[PDB]
């Protein structure tokens, strides 16, 4: 965990596939920070996540999105085995909080607002996060919230979103929109809105709303609550295998939200309904969501910034080696000299 002279007093915070994150003291700013150690140069996929996250986070600047303050690596490509990413330091994440803490409606409202505020900026950049979930939402001791982990992020591509039935997908299962299992590659902004809807539901009850145990079971959970899709929504799905799978299921009634969440704010459930809409084209978009009455205490579009420029619009087709220089190159600005 050699982070050089600049950072000392390392203290473990959390681990995962992304690597491990430790607290640490920044001698130059006297402020304590968070450091993530990554060894991506082991498999090329981890290298793609590393590169997407770095490029995106370096161009992004927003209160509700985690930043990269510094990147620590060896002086030369040969000597570089690991990359250390220095980022905002926060107390906990939504996943940890939901395990043991009941959220007041005021907290649920405030968290949702900040998630959407951050998402407005991401989407304004033509970027999809694609793996929104509680563990990717960090909070500090005054409940300021920042979205992290942009490893699965992509540039939006609505025109190439269609695919076949049961096409495999990487993003976390419980937060996948129904269309992913049916006919979507997850290349439209509506995919993130679904995830935020799932996060809202989870904040209301401290339980994942759709805890599927395997790929297709996820869809079954979703339909068990929303009920069978309408003829209109069925007609929008042109792929036969996808549509006929749906048609093969016995009819299921919708479960009314106020029955699922009897203690919830009624305005919160109206917004939930709109984010967890089956048909992605009818699903609410992030700016509409921000303007929804549930968030009226906070809504101020002039205080909800968008990006100066979008992306442009691959890391899929290059060697773990090829982009080992790309990582080295993109981290160049942080090295002395
Ligand atoms: C994917 N993750 C967890 C990140 O990209 C990340 C988290 C943090 C962080 N800042 N303050 C605390 C953390 C943290 C919380 C929980 C687990 C691991 C790190 C910095 N980058």
UniProtKB/Swiss-Prot annotation:
One annotated GO biological process:
protein phosphorylation
Q: What is the effect of changing residue 169 to A?
A: Inhibits interaction with TPR
Swapping residue 303 to N leads to an effect described as: Inhibits interaction with MAP2K1 but not with TPR
Q: Where in the cell is it found?
A: Cytoplasm, Cytoskeleton, Spindle; Nucleus; Cytoplasm, Cytoskeleton, Microtubule organizing center, Centrosome; Cytoplasm
Where would I find the Protein kinase domain in this sequence? 7-295
- Name the residues annotated as catalytic in the UniProt entry: 131 (proton acceptor)
Indicate which residues form the motif Cytoplasmic retention motif: 300-304
Under the heading PROSITE patterns, the entry gives: MAPK (PS01351), PROTEIN_KINASE_ATP (PS00107), PROTEIN_KINASE_DOM (PS50011), PROTEIN_KINASE_ST (PS00108)
> What broad class describes the main subcellular location of this protein?
cytoplasm
Record-annotated DNA-binding residue ranges: 241-259
State what inhibits or activates this protein: Phosphorylated by MAP2K1/MEK1 and MAP2K2/MEK2 on Thr-167 and Tyr-169 in response to external stimuli like insulin or NGF. Both phosphorylations are required for activity. This phosphorylation causes dramatic conformational changes, which enable full activation and interaction of MAPK1/ERK2 with its substrates. Phosphorylation on Ser-11 by SGK1 results in its activation by enhancing its interaction with MAP2K1/MEK1 and MAP2K2/MEK2. Dephosphorylated and inactivated by DUSP1, DUSP3, DUSP6 and DUSP9. Inactivated by pyrimidylpyrrole inhibitors.
Q: Which reaction does it catalyse?
A: L-seryl-[protein] + ATP = O-phospho-L-seryl-[protein] + ADP + H(+); L-threonyl-[protein] + ATP = O-phospho-L-threonyl-[protein] + ADP + H(+)
Q: What would changing residue 156 to V do, according to UniProt? A: In NS13; results in increased MAPK signaling; increased translocation to the nucleus; reduced interaction with DUSP6; no effect on interaction with MAP2K1
Q: Which GO terms describe its cellular component?
A: azurophil granule lumen; caveola; centrosome; ciliary basal body; cilium; cytoplasm; cytoskeleton; cytosol
Task: Identify the cofactor(s).
Answer: Mg(2+)
Q: Which UniProt keywords apply?
A: Acetylation, Apoptosis, ATP-binding, Cell cycle, Cell junction, Cytoplasm, Cytoskeleton, Disease variant, DNA-binding, Host-virus interaction, Kinase, Membrane, Nucleotide-binding, Nucleus, Phosphoprotein, Repressor, Serine/threonine-protein kinase, Transcription, Transcription regulation, Transferase, Ubl conjugation
Instruction: Give all Phosphothreonine modified positions.
Output: 167, 172
Place the motif Nuclear translocation motif on the sequence. Answer: 309-313
Residue positions where Phosphotyrosine is found in the record = 169
Please give the annotated consequence of changing residue 305 to R.
In NS13; results in increased MAPK signaling; increased translocation to the nucleus; reduced interaction with DUSP6; no effect on interaction with MAP2K1
Give the disease entry from the UniProt record: Noonan syndrome 13: A form of Noonan syndrome, a disease characterized by short stature, facial dysmorphic features such as hypertelorism, a downward eyeslant and low-set posteriorly rotated ears, and a high incidence of congenital heart defects and hypertrophic cardiomyopathy. Other features can include a short neck with webbing or redundancy of skin, deafness, motor delay, variable intellectual deficits, multiple skeletal defects, cryptorchidism, and bleeding diathesis.
Q: What does this protein do?
A: Serine/threonine kinase which acts as an essential component of the MAP kinase signal transduction pathway. MAPK1/ERK2 and MAPK3/ERK1 are the 2 MAPKs which play an important role in the MAPK/ERK cascade. They participate also in a signaling cascade initiated by activated KIT and KITLG/SCF. Depending on the cellular context, the MAPK/ERK cascade mediates diverse biological functions such as cell growth, adhesion, survival and differentiation through the regulation of transcription, translation, cytoskeletal rearrangements. Acts as a transcriptional repressor. Binds to a [GC]AAA[GC] consensus sequence. Repress the expression of interferon gamma-induced genes. Seems to bind to the promoter of CCL5, DMP1, IFIH1, IFITM1, IRF7, IRF9, LAMP3, OAS1, OAS2, OAS3 and STAT1. Transcriptional activity is independent of kinase activity.
Notes concerning its domains: The TXY motif contains the threonine and tyrosine residues whose phosphorylation activates the MAP kinases.
The protein depicted here goes by the name: Mitogen-activated protein kinase 1
Give the organism's phylogenetic lineage.
Answer: Eukaryota, Metazoa, Chordata, Craniata, Vertebrata
Gene designation: MAPK1
């Amino acid at each position: 965990f050699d982070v050089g002279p600049r950072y000392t007093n390392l203290s473990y915070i959390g681990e995962g596939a992304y690597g491990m994150v430790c607290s640490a003291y920044d001698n130059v700013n006297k402020v304590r920070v968070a450091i993530k150690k990554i060894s991506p140069f082991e498999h090329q996929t981890y290298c793609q996540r590393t590169l997407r996250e770095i490029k995106i986070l370096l161009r992004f600047r927003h209160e509700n999105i985690i930043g990269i303050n510094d990147i620590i690596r060896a002086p030369t490509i040969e000597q570089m085995k690991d990359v250390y990413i220095v980022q905002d330091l926060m107390e906990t994440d939504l996943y940890k909080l939901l395990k043991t803490q009941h959220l007041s409606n005021d907290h649920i409202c405030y968290f949702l607002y900040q998630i959407l505020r951050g998402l407005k900026y991401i989407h304004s950049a033509n970027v999809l996060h694609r793996d929104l979930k509680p563990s990717n939402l960090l909070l500090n001791t005054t409940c300021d919230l920042k979205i992290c982990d942009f490893g699965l992020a992509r540039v939006a591509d609505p025109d190439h979103d269609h695919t076949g039935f049961l096409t495999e997908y990487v993003a976390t299962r419980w937060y996948r929109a129904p269309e992913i299992m049916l006919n979507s590659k997850g290349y439209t902004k509506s995919i993130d809105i679904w995830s935020v809807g799932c996060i809202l539901a989870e904040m209301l009850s401290n339980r994942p709303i759709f805890p599927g145990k395997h790929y297709l079971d996820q869809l079954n959970h979703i339909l068990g609550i929303l009920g069978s899709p309408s003829q209109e929504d069925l007609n929008c799905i042109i792929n036969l295998k996808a549509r006929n799978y749906l048609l093969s299921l016995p009819h299921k009634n919708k479960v009314p939200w106020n029955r699922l969440f009897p203690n919830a704010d009624s305005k919160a459930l109206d917004l939930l309904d709109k984010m967890l809409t089956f048909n992605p084209h009818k699903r609410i978009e992030v700016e509409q969501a921000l303007a929804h009455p549930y968030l009226e205490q906070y809504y101020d579009p002039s205080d909800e910034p968008i990006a100066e420029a979008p992306f442009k619009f691959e890391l899929d087709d290059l060697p773990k080696e090829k982009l080992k220089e790309l990582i080295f190159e993109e981290t160049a600005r942080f090295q002395p000299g």
